[PDB]
Structure formats: C-alpha cells, structure tokens
Scaffold this active site. Structure first.
Site, mmCIF file in Angstrom:
data_model
loop_
_atom_site.group_PDB
_atom_site.id
_atom_site.type_symbol
_atom_site.label_atom_id
_atom_site.label_comp_id
_atom_site.label_asym_id
_atom_site.label_seq_id
_atom_site.Cartn_x
_atom_site.Cartn_y
_atom_site.Cartn_z
ATOM 1 N N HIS A 41 65.049 -24.282 53.708
ATOM 2 C CA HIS A 41 63.711 -24.611 52.664
ATOM 3 C C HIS A 41 63.365 -23.653 52.182
ATOM 4 O O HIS A 41 62.910 -24.610 51.181
ATOM 5 C CB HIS A 41 63.036 -25.298 53.759
ATOM 6 C CG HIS A 41 62.085 -24.106 54.863
ATOM 7 N ND1 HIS A 41 62.279 -24.540 55.701
ATOM 8 C CD2 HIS A 41 61.204 -23.507 54.574
ATOM 9 C CE1 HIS A 41 61.515 -23.283 56.022
ATOM 10 N NE2 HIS A 41 60.664 -22.849 55.694
ATOM 11 N N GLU A 72 70.031 -24.640 59.447
ATOM 12 C CA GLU A 72 68.610 -23.935 58.375
ATOM 13 C C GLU A 72 68.633 -23.038 58.740
ATOM 14 O O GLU A 72 67.809 -21.488 57.816
ATOM 15 C CB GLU A 72 67.851 -24.335 59.419
ATOM 16 C CG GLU A 72 65.911 -23.974 58.875
ATOM 17 C CD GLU A 72 65.766 -24.889 57.723
ATOM 18 O OE1 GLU A 72 66.479 -26.295 57.674
ATOM 19 O OE2 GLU A 72 65.111 -24.672 56.437
ATOM 20 N N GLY A 146 53.437 -19.524 56.588
ATOM 21 C CA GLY A 146 53.483 -17.693 56.303
ATOM 22 C C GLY A 146 54.310 -16.657 56.931
ATOM 23 O O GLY A 146 54.911 -15.437 56.432
ATOM 24 N N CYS A 148 57.934 -18.118 58.307
ATOM 25 C CA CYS A 148 59.377 -18.829 58.108
ATOM 26 C C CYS A 148 60.117 -17.461 57.328
ATOM 27 O O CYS A 148 59.201 -16.606 56.552
ATOM 28 C CB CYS A 148 59.265 -19.826 57.300
ATOM 29 S SG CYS A 148 58.501 -21.127 58.006
#
Ligand SMILES: O=C(c1cn[nH]c1)N1CCCC1
Length: 182
Positions: A41, A72, A146, A148
């Site tokens: 992402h 991911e 904040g 990730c």
C-alpha cells in the site's frame, strides 16, 4: 528495557531507513545488499526518498502467494551507494505463532518508538482495506496511523512488518527466508 528491546534496537540502528512515497513516510527494513521491504500500500514507483535523498528504484515487486492472493509485502532494490548488513539468517523459515514480540518504528513523526505487543497469532486470512490477504500475524495492541512498515521482532527473529489494524488489534505481513533467496 530487556533482551526483547535489545534485539529490536540492534535491527533498527543498522537495518532501517525512512522511506517516503506519495502515500507517506514508512519504516523500511533493509534485508541484504540494496534489498529492502515495505507495505505494498506504500505504492512504490520509479523514484523513492530514502532518509530524504532522491533514490532510483532499480526494481520493485508486490508479493502474492501461489493462490494469487495479496501478501502486502513489496520487495524493493534501491540504487543506493551502500549495502545493508545481511540479516537473512534472522528470518523464520515457516509460518508460526510467537510469544513476547516488539513492534519498532522510526519516522519523522515516531522516532525511536518500541512497543511490547505480547503474543503473536498466526491469524492467516484477513480482509485488509477490502483486499483478501494471506500470511497475517495478529497482536492485541491498538496500533495507529504512522506505524505501517514497523518491524516485528522476537529475541533472535525478524518475523514481519506492520501493515494495518482495526483499533483493538494490529496486523503484520510475515517475512519468510524463502522471499530473499538469491
Ligand atoms: O524479489 C526480489 C528479491 C528478494 N530478495 N532478493 C531479491 N526483488 C524483486 C525486486 C528487487 C528485489
């Protein structure tokens, strides 16, 4: 404070950079040579900022499992003039549950942040922001925007990177040794 935080600190001080994309600032784990990981992402492009320096992305890759399901994790190779310490021997070989993990973050917003998240479940499937995702680790800490890309460690193992939460629980994508064979 204890041997958990000692191992987390050793990883943060030598194997992390601050990565900036158009989707924000992320903790980015360097694994070996010029190869690092970031949540998919983050939407890595041709150019990324590494500790506020414009860096060409020589190559990048969004990992999926052999059922063609999102993991991911994006693996990035950076046009950087310096190699990371090789930490591949700290990566687990198999999917597992863990005790007594630490989530560590280093950004402009959250410098030198360490969170004892406790027990980690092999959760497996998660619908993450509407995307079916596999190989998810879960911990019962109310993680926030904040964090990730934050690194999840136990004493002697680097087990995942933080990719989301629901306000009560936090979720990490597994790191496996087999992702970084060369
Ligand atoms: O899959 C890999 C990779 C993982 N470990 N070594 C290389 N890469 C794709 C993007 C550049 C590196």
């Amino acid at each position: 404070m204890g041997p958990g935080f000692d191992f987390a600190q050793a990883i943060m001080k030598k194997n992390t950079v601050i990565a900036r994309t158009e989707k924000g600032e992320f903790t980015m784990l360097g694994v070996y040579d010029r190869v690092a990981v970031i949540p998919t992402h983050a939407s890595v492009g041709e150019i990324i900022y590494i500790n506020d320096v414009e860096t060409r992305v020589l190559d990048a890759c969004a990992l999926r499992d052999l059922t063609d399901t999102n993991l991911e994790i994006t693996i990035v190779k950076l046009d950087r003039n310096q190699k990371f310490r090789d930490i591949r021997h700290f990566l687990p070989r198999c999917e597992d549950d863990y005790n007594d993990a630490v989530l560590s973050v280093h950004t402009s917003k959250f410098p030198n942040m360490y969170i004892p998240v406790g027990q980690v479940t092999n959760y497996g499937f998660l619908n993450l922001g509407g995307t079916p995702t596999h190989r998810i680790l879960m911990y019962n800490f109310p993680t926030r925007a904040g964090q990730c890309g934050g690194v999840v460690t136990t004493t002697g193992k680097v087990i995942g990177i933080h990719v989301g939460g629901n306000g009560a629980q936090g979720f990490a994508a597994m790191l496996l040794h087999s992702y970084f064979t060369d």
